[PDB]
Amino acid sequence: MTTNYIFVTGGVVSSLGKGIAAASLAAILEARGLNVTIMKLDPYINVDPGTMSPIQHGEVFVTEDGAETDLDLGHYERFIRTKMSRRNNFTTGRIYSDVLRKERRGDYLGATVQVIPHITNAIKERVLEGGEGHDVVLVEIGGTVGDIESLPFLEAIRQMAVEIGREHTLFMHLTLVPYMAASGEVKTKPTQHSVKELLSIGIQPDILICRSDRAVPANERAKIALFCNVPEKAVISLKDVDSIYKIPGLLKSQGLDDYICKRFSLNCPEANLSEWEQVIFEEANPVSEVTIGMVGKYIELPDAYKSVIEALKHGGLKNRVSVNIKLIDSQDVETRGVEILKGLDAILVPGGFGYRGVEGMITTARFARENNIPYLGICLGMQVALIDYARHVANMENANSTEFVPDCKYPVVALITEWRDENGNVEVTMRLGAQQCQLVDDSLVRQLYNAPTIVERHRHRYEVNNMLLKQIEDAGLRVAGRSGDDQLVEIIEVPNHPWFVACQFHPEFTSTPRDGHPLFAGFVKAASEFQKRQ
Amino acid sequence: MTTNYIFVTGGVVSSLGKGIAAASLAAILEARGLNVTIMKLDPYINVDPGTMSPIQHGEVFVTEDGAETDLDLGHYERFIRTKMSRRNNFTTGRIYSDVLRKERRGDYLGATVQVIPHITNAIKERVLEGGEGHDVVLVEIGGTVGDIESLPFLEAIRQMAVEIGREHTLFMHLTLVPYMAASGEVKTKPTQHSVKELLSIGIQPDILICRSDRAVPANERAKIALFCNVPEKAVISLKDVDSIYKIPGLLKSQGLDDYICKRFSLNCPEANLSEWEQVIFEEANPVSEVTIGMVGKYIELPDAYKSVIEALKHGGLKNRVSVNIKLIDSQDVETRGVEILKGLDAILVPGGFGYRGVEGMITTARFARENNIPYLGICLGMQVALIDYARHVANMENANSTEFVPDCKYPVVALITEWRDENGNVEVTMRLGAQQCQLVDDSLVRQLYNAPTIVERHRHRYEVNNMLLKQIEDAGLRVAGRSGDDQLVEIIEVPNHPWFVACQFHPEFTSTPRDGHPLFAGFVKAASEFQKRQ
Amino acid sequence: MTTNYIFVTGGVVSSLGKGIAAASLAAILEARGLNVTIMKLDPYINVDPGTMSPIQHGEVFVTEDGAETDLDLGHYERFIRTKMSRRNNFTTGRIYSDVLRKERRGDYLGATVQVIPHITNAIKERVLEGGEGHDVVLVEIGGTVGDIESLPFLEAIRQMAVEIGREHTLFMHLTLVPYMAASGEVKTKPTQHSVKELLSIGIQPDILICRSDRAVPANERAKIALFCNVPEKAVISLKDVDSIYKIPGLLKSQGLDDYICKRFSLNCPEANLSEWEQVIFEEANPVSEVTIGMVGKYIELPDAYKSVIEALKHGGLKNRVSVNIKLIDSQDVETRGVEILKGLDAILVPGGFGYRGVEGMITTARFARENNIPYLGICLGMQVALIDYARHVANMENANSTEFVPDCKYPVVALITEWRDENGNVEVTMRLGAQQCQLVDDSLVRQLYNAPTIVERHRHRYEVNNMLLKQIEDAGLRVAGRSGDDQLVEIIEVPNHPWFVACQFHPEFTSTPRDGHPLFAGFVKAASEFQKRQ
């Protein structure tokens, strides 16, 4: 039980799919009974993605331990069963923060603190932390080799390879092998120049993963094998694919996992990818099609809703339904009205912060509730569902969240400390990561989850106001799930409706292609049943 | 006045179209009344392409002065009217041969001969020799920047830029800006890394020519401008095109020629590209279509017949005929028979050396003659036409070339020194470049060329045997052209045929898209007339 | 068994003593009973040093086979007993000449000839030719790593290391570790940057030879070991020394030969360096001192007479005489007179071509003969001795060489084809390498060499004119040695003189510190005897 490390780097361009490649390889190794994990080294200065805007860098992924991480850890958890934590993602900012803190504590004993060895040492320590207790650790190095931003990471993993040795370390380098119409051939020259940059900083690649818009032929792979001084079997073709679920099979068919198990002297049975083959089959053979509207305030970058989009796809797989995801700007509902929500088989309102576009989401929730269109609200999607029902059924004029209208008469959503009734009377911070939720008997979610308790992940400040809840309950709304000593509302259901569910937690973070998710499976099923009625 | 130099380099990949880009820019500058020339610096060790196989290198192009050169000089002569010579193309091989000859002789006076300064000095001397006496000299550096083979060339042109100054030198660097489906954007990172390699060898690019399979948008051009420290108008998009004739217009529309004229302080009128607009109009508006079979022994690389393929296209422009060029392996005629010559409106047998596939070409010549299918034979194409007629009409059994069957009874083709009749009685080396040919009255070619004398370019050793010619003439074959004191046969015609012409010279080398060529215009017209008769 | 290769490279500066280091290591390995050889790869374009001036390049060394080579092959033959040939030295010029000859001929079968693989293949072929049939082959790469001139050599030896493997190849890299008064320490940063340049071209050094003006301490060697990823015992201190004969001992004391034998799995006994210890003892314990004047025309670079200077030192070892070598410009004898030849215990006139300074050498030869000062003339030194005697004893007015005065009345020195007497009557090119010489009975050289025949090496065109010889013999000059069928004069002696010898051959090329040389031993002894008589 010596821990093995696969260092995953990228050359020529950034957008090679280093994360998907790492996750896909990890999936093959896990299917051989190996204990595998993945970690992402990000050369950005942000202490963590917590601050990074959804519009700029896509969704903030939440691990069970409540870490705010890169969306790549979503890819990792959708490919392997090993649970991600704070240890599986860190930035240059984190490393510099670590070292600056160690200096304050006096750990360096008045020594001059240097990129080598002190920054490189801090990097190695965090890689070992995240890696130890596993058979194989895949370490994705963000950036493009030759850029200055990743030089400390590359020096750190170079040192690790010398210490640990070539028996228990491999360098897997992704490269672009682009097609030129002029020559009717894919070109290895960019790979030649990228590998030279790698050699210049003291790294010899063991494995070349050749990215192209088509198969990289044996002739070109043999050319790369010779100039890199690696076996031809260590040069892998990874063409553009219509589904990332195919990549594990494509890598296995070229025997990449065999090469890795040989290099690390790992005796394990053949990879059983039957579950991945099933996912590919399901995706390729939908029985019917549905159009589901995702009404949010960050649609300008789809990666803002990465896990929600994948969760809707996984809902399709389990129902053998093709899901047409129509990304709708909630602000367009405010200006152009409810006419742009026509021709939808179901409506999803995802998570978000700030008031911009929220009134459009409240209108969207009302439209879905009144017209019996299947509805799933996530976090902000539950708030607007509660606000809708408060205003338009419970007759709480201008009911809102204190996040949006602090001095509103009916703050149906607010921080626990702000909880007040309509008369301003009172009783007597961000919730992050996994928490147990108690499901109410005879609720739809109790039926779908088939358990009295569930574990789902939070990323929110503002709660359902329990002081104004009973008046909304009396108006017909049903509490389907609660959590903690304060009995905070986790799930609500509108019962006089074919399928209307809204939750505080982020169910998209526990959805996988192989296992699906009870809420998303139920939601897409309801969408198909609605579509058949129309 | 002062001679200006544009050094044309390429990064990321070899196959950027550096020659086409240089030729297209030269076309714009010529259309502004400037005296422009182009030269090609090839990093190969071959003293010249004379030895290099067509299937390895593409066609050997022949200049008027009889130099054997890169096919790029064909691009140059098809875009500008400045005539190419030996001075417009040289290899590393030529430079080392020059320096070794100077050294072993004693020109260096017992000095140590070094890459710097002696190899770089030899390079600069040949660039000056080709350039001086022109307003603008475009110098294409073969290879990809970063490779070791072009480092001496790049050091040479770096020194020239220092000596001459930034007032009369520009660095124009072609780069690949490839599209990634993953990012949905073209990627500048390869340009970033390529420019870094240029800077490391002391070259700052003035102009970036951005190659891609689509337009490089203003936002990406703005990024390249900033990281290269060049004006935005010095960053040019050159997307993949269906027609190279459009490239002059594409570059002019982005003001590339304006920027160059400003940098070199050239006061000249706006480029009138009406001649190129006309070529584009002709090409886009064909009246009819033909299929012309090109039957040869080098079809595995189409660039083996680069100038012939372009000459057929030019023949189409002048007739408003779309030419579908079907490359047919002459060895397939030997094995599968004349079956594979079905559905052709005309047949062209191009040049070649060695006996492999020649019997297939003789069979092809016979097929075209007997079935009244328009035929054009070039060099070897004339040999197989003469052999066909000698064997199958003049009843000269197994008539051949001494190149193929040295001891044959009827050497109808042979070296002048080998000339013998069928009884072995006799009379009492490579022809290269332009030579006057005298056309015979009442010949098809005398009408087509509409002149008593023409100038065409040779690349051949083996002549028509004048000792056996009179017997072939008596059998009905006509001599249509002669040259020199030995009265060597240059053109033959089969009169009892709609269009049957074969020439010793290479007419494809004097064909241009603007001027066309009388022989190819006549050939494609005959192909159109045959197609209509069917 | 399997041939082992040690690739010897240099970084930071050129003048590291790569040749001396290679030769000194080879000496240790030979003293362990191994069959060892050395070869020099020069990045100069000169086909060979035959053209290169002595004042530019240093002496042209001549091997037994008559190859004109780098003076480093003199270092090699003075450290190991393995005889050098044409195979032990080649230039970039030779490689390009080889490849151009192969190309223009037709060995590459119409292929494109490229730096990689064709130039690198030609390099590897010549390394194999020189190396195969030896236990250990030391391959010295001329130039400084990072320079463009040696990139093909470094790529060639990189490929060899991959092909042969790390079991039978080592990279030994010389580096400068310079002392800074400011820091009071030697600096490893230049070694760091040099090794980075090696890594960028795909070479990992196995051994670091650290050059400095003092010992590189264990702490600095430990730093170099870590950043190069080599054992501490693979990092060697080679400080500046007063005697190159000490370097074998210095390297052995640090176990360099032990590390090499271990890496190559050579089981051989410990190096016995007693022969080198004896040379060091002799050198350190002289009994008397002499001043020997070397009067020539290339003294502006002492390396012009490298082997002659070493041969005089070896003459000192055998006699326990400390030799003070005073380099005197022969042109200063022409201007200032024989004043500048005062206080000399002996006079040596070495080889040379052209008339500049020759009259000064004739005056020098006369001075030594008339004043009974021991004289040794080598090649030109023999010519000026013959001319001196012809003019001033045999009364042949203005006697000269045809090289200097072609139409002179008494051409006592001339080409065999030019041989004429004073009346213009006649009888009815460069001699290179080892030739047998027959020594005459009762001659000084017959006693010194203690054999009737000797083998010495030539580099000359102009011979003693046998037509005018008998008259010079009658005047008292003695012929002491002859060669060949033409009975060419090899050695002359002035008998009425304590020690006056002059030879056509270059005896300095067969002198070694261990074996000495009979002629130089006799010369230095005569110098000592003259000094005592004063």
Ligand SMILES: Nc1ccn([C@@H]2O[C@H](COP(=O)(O)OP(=O)(O)OP(=O)(O)O)[C@@H](O)[C@H]2O)c(=O)n1
């Ligand atoms: N470090 C290197 C490696 C290769 N070459 C040169 O690269 C040329 C071949 O380049 P190219 O024609 O672009 O082909 P490939 O290297 O095969 O590249 P690609 O796969 O992109 O076609 C050869 O002449 C060789 O001398 C070089 O100069 N320096």
Ligand SMILES: Nc1ccn([C@@H]2O[C@H](COP(=O)(O)OP(=O)(O)OP(=O)(O)O)[C@@H](O)[C@H]2O)c(=O)n1
């Ligand atoms: N010499 C350089 C230049 C840039 N960067 C880094 O490159 C990153 C951006 O790279 P990428 O995301 O690939 O985008 P672009 O550079 O815009 O490249 P492309 O046009 O290919 O997307 C930045 O974080 C910057 O710190 C670097 O490390 N070293």
Ligand SMILES: Nc1ccn([C@@H]2O[C@H](COP(=O)(O)OP(=O)(O)OP(=O)(O)O)[C@@H](O)[C@H]2O)c(=O)n1
């Ligand atoms: N980028 C360069 C620059 C120079 N050279 C080579 O460097 C050699 C000269 O190096 P060297 O003898 O060390 O002399 P200098 O360069 O003058 O260095 P120094 O001042 O240290 O003596 C020349 O043959 C030249 O071809 C090279 O290969 N690449």
